[PDB]
Ligand binder design. Sequence first.
Ligand SMILES: *[C@@H]1O[C@H](CO[C@@H]2O[C@@H](C)[C@@H](O)[C@@H](O)[C@@H]2O)[C@@H](O[C@@H]2O[C@H](CO)[C@@H](O[C@@H]3O[C@H](CO)[C@@H](O)[C@H](O[C@H]4O[C@H](CO)[C@@H](O)[C@H](O)[C@@H]4O)[C@@H]3O)[C@H](O)[C@H]2NC(C)=O)[C@H](O)[C@H]1NC(C)=O
Ligand SMILES: *[C@@H]1O[C@H](CO)[C@@H](O)[C@H](O)[C@H]1NC(C)=O
Ligand SMILES: *[C@@H]1O[C@H](CO)[C@@H](O)[C@H](O)[C@H]1NC(C)=O
Ligand SMILES: *[C@@H]1O[C@H](CO)[C@@H](O)[C@H](O)[C@H]1NC(C)=O
Length: 516
Amino acid sequence: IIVTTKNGKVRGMNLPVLGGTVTAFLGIPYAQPPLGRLRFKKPQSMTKWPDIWNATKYANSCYQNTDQSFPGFVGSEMWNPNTELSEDCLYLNVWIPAPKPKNATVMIWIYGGGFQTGTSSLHVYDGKFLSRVERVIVVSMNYRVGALGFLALPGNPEAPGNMGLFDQQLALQWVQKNIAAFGGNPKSVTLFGESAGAVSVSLHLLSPRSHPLFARAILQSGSSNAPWAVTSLYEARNRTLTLAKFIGCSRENETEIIKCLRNKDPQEILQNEVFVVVNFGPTVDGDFLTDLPDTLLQLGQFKKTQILVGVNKDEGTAFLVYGAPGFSKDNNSIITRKEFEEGLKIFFPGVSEFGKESILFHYMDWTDDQRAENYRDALDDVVGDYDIICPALEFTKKFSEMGNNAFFYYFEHRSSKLPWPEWMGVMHGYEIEFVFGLPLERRANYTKAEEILSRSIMKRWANFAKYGNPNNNSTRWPVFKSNEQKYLTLNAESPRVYTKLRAQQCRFWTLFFPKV
Ligand SMILES: *[C@@H]1O[C@H](CO[C@@H]2O[C@@H](C)[C@@H](O)[C@@H](O)[C@@H]2O)[C@@H](O[C@@H]2O[C@H](CO)[C@@H](O[C@@H]3O[C@H](CO)[C@@H](O)[C@H](O[C@H]4O[C@H](CO)[C@@H](O)[C@H](O)[C@@H]4O)[C@@H]3O)[C@H](O)[C@H]2NC(C)=O)[C@H](O)[C@H]1NC(C)=O
Ligand SMILES: *[C@@H]1O[C@H](CO)[C@@H](O)[C@H](O)[C@H]1NC(C)=O
Ligand SMILES: *[C@@H]1O[C@H](CO)[C@@H](O)[C@H](O)[C@H]1NC(C)=O
Ligand SMILES: *[C@@H]1O[C@H](CO)[C@@H](O)[C@H](O)[C@H]1NC(C)=O
């Protein structure tokens, strides 16, 4: 099982997957290690090796602070890295079906994590089931996060900004030059990702030099037009200078502020990263991204192709348990009105006190919901609608006004193995295990219905990658058009077709709230 690339030969391994076999290549380098003078710089093309690269084990994860908000709790630690942390982390993984195909569709996964955390070696990102069941080739790459991936000085090639996004772009370039040798069709590539990875996929749609590197796109719970996605270039010069003051590298000569940072330790950078305020994420760098995503969308400046977008029913709950008063994973988080208004101050830092009164009126005082859970559920809807759902709906509507086919889903199933409490519902991030087919292993002790639901989701995802349409006697997933705006619910009982998701709420965020 040796495949010959353009930089050398790589060895793989065969995995027993669901009574069959899947060939996996874990840890193929796609760029020179960004060590020394290459730190904070854009990735350089990988050098050649005459030997055989073994690629039989998940490579290193990029340096990142780990989540320690809930010690020992699996619901938080399942997202922490599971390999050694090092700056030498620019590697990718490939999963080829067995027997080897000849022109298989390729699906490339881009993990999320607020552009500060994440790795492709997580168990929930294991592509072997998807390659087995749907006979697609699955690719995933590690890209730099935090300051080491998004430290920005305007126009300074020592730290230009969006380095982590260029890491993804170079990994897409590797697929165009090498996936044919593995049995994949370089003209049938689909990008899919979740949260910050969905922001990444939607930024590749807005980056012209990425257009020829893929065919279609899938956005799970994220889009680059979200309020938290992209900063301006001056906003990114600040924070970069603020970090320099905290770490002790303040210079009046800018290009040598980076020479001081290149000689600090990676753990030293991570400890001062958090004191700056997404502290180091995508910016309008003028190279990868030339304008704010909302401007590029209004100008029609994006790749014209099909997209598949969707959100989960309870997007906001995961946000609230990490920094909102009254919320806890150890009780029902029944909050008072005072705690509600303090939650708005956290998630709406600059808005006025009348702006917060507008939110409270449209989500609470406009109706008669006198349940004890009113303020709690409404604050989940406020954060979910403002930060995830309504931006994703606006992204899909823009692609539809221009005449591109789009498909929208509404995930409603809560995993029977969800470790978080019940008040959090269908959380941000917990559709991924159904997309990657984890309920198919009967030893994982998912319900039989969850295995069926997972096979359905994997089929719809793979159909969209292969044919540009997720759809047969099953419930048809209609096209999302700008007028009717039909979407499909994803659940274990019976998927339903509805129209205009959260329409009243999104009309408040896009038509009325900007005016207060
Ligand atoms: C759900 O849980 C949250 C989180 O609380 C934490 O988990 C709980 C399961 C429980 O173990 C808690 O003890 C634990 O902190 C609850 O929200 C927290 O509520 C507590 C009070 O119950 C708040 O702590 C208090 O805050 C005040 C500062 O504004 C201050 O007056 C208090 O200190 C005084 O009183 C204590 C006695 O409690 C005394 O020891 C001190 O010396 C002092 O006099 C006290 O620190 C937390 O700030 C709250 N947390 C947040 C994030 O807001 C929540 O109430 C609970 N909900 C339900 C419905 O049960
Ligand atoms: C690569 O894998 C082969 C086959 O298992 C093994 O013989 C070899 O030792 C490995 N290479 C290294 C450097 O360990
Ligand atoms: C794969 O399909 C593309 C069109 O999608 C075609 O141009 C190409 O020749 C095919 N390659 C192989 C190896 O079958
Ligand atoms: C970043 O911006 C804040 C707000 O204007 C300012 O006070 C601070 O000095 C800036 N940080 C710099 C220039 O390092």
